[PDB]
């Protein structure tokens, strides 16, 4: 969270990433674990990576290492990032994105949409039919 903490985690990442290619492999993670007296199996090292492996490529990049350093699972971390995006649109903070809020924030992000384009976007995302898009409907719209 803090600028100091993140700088500490970047130091740790660079240490673990011995070849400097920007990703931590099971081999690199195993070296560290064994220097700290553990004896994880190859399967257990792979599970440690899979727990934070948001993009599914089987190695840890720095954004996923931040998840690991926060001691979180990738599902918790992804939900937090989706909610950050949701709050960009939910300007009044009431937990629902209105047509006006969607039109407004989209316009200020450079996407000029017609009023009809906006109405249909809300209608498509609005599962329960209340005329607004709540968080779980937002999650579903992004699949």
Ligand X SMILES: CC1(C)c2[nH]c3cc(Br)c(Cl)cc3c2C[C@@]23CN4CCC[C@]4(C[C@@H]12)C(=O)N3
Nearest CA to 117 among 131, 132, 129, 106?
106
Residue from 64, 102, 103, 132 in contact with ligand X (CB under 6 A)? 102
Helix H or strand E segment including 134: strand 133-134
Is residue 101 a known part of a binding site?
A: yes
CA dist., res. 44 & res. 26, Å (int)? 9
Q: How far is the CB of 26 from ligand X (least distance, A)?
A: 30
DSSP 83-122: HHHHHHH-TT-SSEE-HHHHHHHHHHTT----HHHHHHHH
Task: Give φ, ψ of 132 to 5 degrees.
Answer: -135, 165
Distances from the Cα of 42 to the Cα of 25, 39, 46, angstroms? 11, 10, 6
19 binds, among Ca ion, ligand X, Zn ion, none (CB under 5 to 8 A by kind): Ca ion
Q: Name the residue nearer to ligand X (CB basis): 69 or 141.
A: 141
Residues contributing to the site for Ca ion (CB under 5 A)? 17, 19, 21, 53, 55, 57, 90, 92, 94, 96, 126, 128, 130
92 binds, among Ca ion, ligand X, Zn ion, none (CB under 5 to 8 A by kind): Ca ion
Q: Which positions from 54 through 83 interact with Zn ion, judged by CB under 5 A?
A: 77
**Per-residue contact flags (x/-) with ligand X for residues 107 to 136, judged by CB under 6 A:** --------------xx--x-------x---
Q: Is 89 in the site for ligand X (CB under 6 A)?
A: yes
Residue ranges of the binding site: 17, 19, 21, 23, 28, 53, 55, 57, 59, 64, 90, 92, 94, 96, 101, 126, 128, 130, 132, 137
């Amino acid at each position: 969270l803090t600028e100091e903490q993140i700088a500490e985690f970047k130091e740790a990442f660079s240490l673990f990433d011995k070849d400097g290619d920007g990703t931590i492999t099971t081999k690199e993670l195993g070296t560290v674990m064994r220097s700290l007296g553990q004896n994880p199996t190859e399967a257990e090292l792979q599970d440690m990576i899979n727990e934070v492996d948001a993009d599914g490529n089987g190695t840890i990049d720095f954004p996923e290492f931040l998840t690991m350093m926060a001691r979180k699972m990738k599902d918790t971390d992804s939900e937090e990032e989706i909610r950050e995006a949701f709050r960009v649109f939910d300007k009044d903070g009431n937990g629902y994105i209105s047509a006006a809020e969607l039109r407004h924030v989209m316009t200020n992000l450079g996407e000029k949409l017609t009023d009809e384009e906006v109405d249909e976007m809300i209608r498509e995302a609005d599962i329960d039919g209340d005329g607004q898009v709540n968080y779980e409907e937002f999650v579903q719209m992004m699949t």
